[PDB]
Amino acid sequence: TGTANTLFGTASTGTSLFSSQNNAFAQNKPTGFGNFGTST
Amino acid sequence: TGTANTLFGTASTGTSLFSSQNNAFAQNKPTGFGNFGTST
Amino acid sequence: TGTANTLFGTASTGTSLFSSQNNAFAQNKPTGFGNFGTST
Amino acid sequence: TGTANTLFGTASTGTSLFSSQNNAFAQNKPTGFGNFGTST
Amino acid sequence: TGTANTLFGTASTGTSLFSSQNNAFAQNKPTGFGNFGTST
Amino acid sequence: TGTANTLFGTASTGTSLFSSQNNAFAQNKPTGFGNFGTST
Amino acid sequence: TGTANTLFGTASTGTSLFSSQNNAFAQNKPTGFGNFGTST
Amino acid sequence: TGTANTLFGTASTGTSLFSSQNNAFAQNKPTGFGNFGTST
Amino acid sequence: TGTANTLFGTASTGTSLFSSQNNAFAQNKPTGFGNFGTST
Amino acid sequence: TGTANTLFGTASTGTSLFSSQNNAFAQNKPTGFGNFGTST
Amino acid sequence: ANTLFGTASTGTSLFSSQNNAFAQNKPTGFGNFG
Amino acid sequence: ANTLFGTASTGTSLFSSQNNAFAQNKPTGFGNFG
Amino acid sequence: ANTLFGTASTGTSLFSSQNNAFAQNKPTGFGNFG
Amino acid sequence: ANTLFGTASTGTSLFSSQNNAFAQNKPTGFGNFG
Amino acid sequence: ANTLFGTASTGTSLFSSQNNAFAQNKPTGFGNFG
Amino acid sequence: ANTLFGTASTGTSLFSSQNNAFAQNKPTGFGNFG
Amino acid sequence: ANTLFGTASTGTSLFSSQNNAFAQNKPTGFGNFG
Amino acid sequence: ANTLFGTASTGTSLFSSQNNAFAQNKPTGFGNFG
Amino acid sequence: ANTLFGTASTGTSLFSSQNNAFAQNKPTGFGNFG
Amino acid sequence: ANTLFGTASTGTSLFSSQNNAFAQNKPTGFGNFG
Amino acid sequence: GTANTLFGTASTGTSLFSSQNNAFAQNKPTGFGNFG
Amino acid sequence: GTANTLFGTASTGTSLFSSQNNAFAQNKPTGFGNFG
Amino acid sequence: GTANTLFGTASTGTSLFSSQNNAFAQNKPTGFGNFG
Amino acid sequence: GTANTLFGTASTGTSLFSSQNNAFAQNKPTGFGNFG
Amino acid sequence: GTANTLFGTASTGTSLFSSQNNAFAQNKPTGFGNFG
Amino acid sequence: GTANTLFGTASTGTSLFSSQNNAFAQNKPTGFGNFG
Amino acid sequence: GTANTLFGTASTGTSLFSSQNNAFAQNKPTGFGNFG
Amino acid sequence: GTANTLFGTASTGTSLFSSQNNAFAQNKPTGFGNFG
Amino acid sequence: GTANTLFGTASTGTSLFSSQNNAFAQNKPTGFGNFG
Amino acid sequence: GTANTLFGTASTGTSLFSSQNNAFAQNKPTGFGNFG
């Protein structure tokens, strides 16, 4: 809820739910998430 | 909910749900998400 | 919900659901998402 | 819901659902999404 | 829902569902989406 | 739903469903979407 | 809730729920999350 | 709740729930989280 | 609740719940968390 | 609650609940936490 | 006296977008001079 | 006296977006001169 | 006297986004001169 | 005298986002001159 | 005299985000000159 | 005289985030000149 | 005279985050000149 | 004269975080010149 | 004269964090010149 | 004259953390010049 | 040399003494004054 | 040399003595004054 | 040499004596003054 | 040499005597003064 | 040599005598003064 | 040699006599003064 | 040699006589003075 | 040799005569004075 | 040789005659004075 | 030889004649004086 202010970069204030960030020089099959089976 | 303000970059205030970001120099089959089977 | 304001860049306030961003120098078969089977 | 205002760039306030962005220098078969089978 | 205003660029407020953007220097068979089989 | 106003660029407020944008310097067979078989 | 302000970098104030970040020089099958089966 | 301010780096004030960060020079199958089965 | 201010580094004031950080030179199957079965 | 200020490093004032940090030169299956079964 | 009764209900919306703009007294004047 | 009764209900929205903008007295004047 | 009765209820929203903006007296003047 | 009665209730929201902005008297003037 | 009655209740929110911004008298002037 | 009655209650929130910002008289002026 | 009545109650919050910011008279001026 | 009545109660919070910031008269001026 | 009545009570908090910041007259000026 | 009535009570806190910061007149000036 | 855009502006000739004032709000922006 | 963008601006000719003032709010921004 | 962007600006010609003033709020930003 | 970005700015020509003033608030930022 | 970014700025030409003043608030920031 | 970033800035050409003043608040920051 | 970052800055060319003044508050920070 | 970071700065070229003044508060920090 | 960090700075080129003044408060910190 | 950190700084090139002054408060810290 508080004010974010950078000068050169990223100012974030939001809520990030479920964020995957796999990051390398070399990767083999990087997956973010799996399958989503939703019922109602 | 708070104010974001950069000068050179990214000011974000929104809510990011389910964000995958796999990033390398070399990748092999990077997937974000899987299958989505939704029923109602 | 809060105000975003950059000068040179990206000011975002919206909600991003399900965002995949796989990004490299070299990729092989990068997929964002899978199959979408939806029934009602 | 909050005001976005850049000067040079992207001000976004909308909600982005299901956005794939695979981006490299060299890619081989980058797919955004899969198949969409929808029934009602 | 909030006001977007850039000066040089993109002000967006709409909701973007299902947006693929695969973009490189060199690509081989980049597909956005797959097949769409819809029944009712 | 909120007002978009750029000066030089793109102000968008509409909802974009299913938008593929594969764009490179060199491409080979870039397809937007697949086949559309719809029955009723 | 308090104000964040960097000059060169990342000022964050938002709440991040469920954030995986596996990052190396070389990885083999890095997954962020698993499967999501949700019912209501 | 208190003000964070770096000059070159990361000023954070938000609450981070459930953050996994496994990071090496070489990894083999690093997973952030497991499966999510949620019912209501 | 108190003010954090570095010059080169990380100033944090937020509350971090449930943060795993397993990090080596070489790892084999580092997991952050396990499975999440939640009911209501 | 008191002010933290480094010059090169980490100034922290927040409360960290449940933080695992297993870190070596070589590890084999380092897990942060176990399974989370929550009911209400 | 002018009245507007407006409703816009959707039921079971999947992968959809609904924008509802209930504006009351929204004038737009481009050039107001004097 | 002008009144607006506005409602926008959705039921069982999956993977969806709903934007509801209830504005009252929202004028927009581009050039106000004098 | 102008009144706005606004409601926007959703029930059982999965993976969704709801934005509700209840603005009252939101003018926007680009160029105010004199 | 203008009044706004605004409510935005959700029930059983899973993996969702709700933004509720109740603004009262929010003007925006770009160029105020004199 | 303008009044705003605002409420935003959620019940049983799992893995969700709720942002509630109750602002009263929030003007924004970009260029104030003289 | 302008009044704002604001409430934002959640009941049984699991793994969730609630941000409640009750601001009163929050102006923002970018360039104040003279 | 402007008044704000603000409340944000949660009941039975598990693994959750609640941020409540009750600000009164919070102006922000970027460039104050003269 | 402006008043703010603010309360933020939680009951039975497990593994949770509550931040409550009751600020009164918190201005922020970036560049004050003259 | 501006007043702030602030309370933040929790009952039965397990494994939790509560931060309560009751600030009164907290200005922040980045560049004060002259 | 501005007054702040602040209270933050917890009852039966297990394995918890409570931080209560009651500051009065806490200004922060980064660059004071002249 | 040559300049290729697909969208946007491709410009080849050199550009000298160019003023531009970009804001959301400007009071008396000038590029140039008087010559001689 | 050559300049290739797909979107945006590709510029090849050199650029000398260029002023630009970028803000959200400016009081009397000038690029240049008087010549002789 | 050559410059390739996909989005953004690709620029090949050299750039000399360039002023830019970037802020949220500026009082009398100048790039350059007077010549002779 | 060559410069490749996908997003952002790729620049090949050399850059000499460049001023930039970056802030949230500036009172009279100048890049350069007077020549001769 | 060559410079490759995916996002951000890739720059190949050398950079000499460059001033930049970065703050949240600046009173009269100058890059350069007068030449001769 | 070569410089590869994925995000951020990749720079190959050498950099000489560069000034930068980084603060939250600066009174008259100068990079350089006068030449001759 | 070569420089590889994933995020941040990869720099290959050598850097000589570089000044930087980093603070939260500075009164008249200078990098360099006068040349000749 | 070669320099690999994942986050942060990878730098290969040598660095000579570099000044940096790091504080929370500085009165007249100088890197360098006058040349000749 | 080679330098590998995951986070932070990996530096390969040698560093000679480098000054740095680190404090919370400094009155006139200098790296270097005058050359000739 | 080679230098491996996971977090922090890995440095391979040799370092010669380096000054650093570390305090909470310094009055006129100098690294170096005058050359010739």
Numbering used by the authors:
A (entry chain P), B (entry chain M), C (entry chain J), D (entry chain G), E (entry chain D), F (entry chain A), ...: 85 to 124
K (entry chain C), L (entry chain F), M (entry chain I), N (entry chain L), O (entry chain O), P (entry chain R), ...: 88 to 121
U (entry chain B), V (entry chain E), W (entry chain H), X (entry chain K), Y (entry chain N), Z (entry chain Q), ...: 86 to 121
Give excerpts from the publication.
The human nucleoporin Nup98 forms fusion proteins in certain types of malignant leukaemia, is a critical component of the permeability barrier of the nuclear pore complex and is mislocalized in cytosolic deposits in Alzheimer’s disease. The most aggregation-prone segment comprises residues 85–124 (named Nup98FG85). All four fibril types display a parallel in-register β-structure comprising short and kinked β-strands.
To gain insight into the molecular organization of cohesive FG-repeat interactions, Nup98FG85 was allowed to aggregate in pure water. The most abundant polymorph fibril, pm1, was resolved at a resolution of 2.8 Å and is formed by three asymmetrically arranged protofilaments. The structure of the most abundant polymorph, pm1, deviates considerably from the flat two-dimensional (2D) arrangement of cross-β-structure sheets. This leads to one chain forming contacts with several layers of the opposing protofilaments and the formation of a cluster of phenylalanine side chains (bottom). For example, the aromatic ring of F102 contacts three other phenylalanine rings located up to three layers away. The pm1 structure contains a large cavity that is predominantly lined by polar residues.
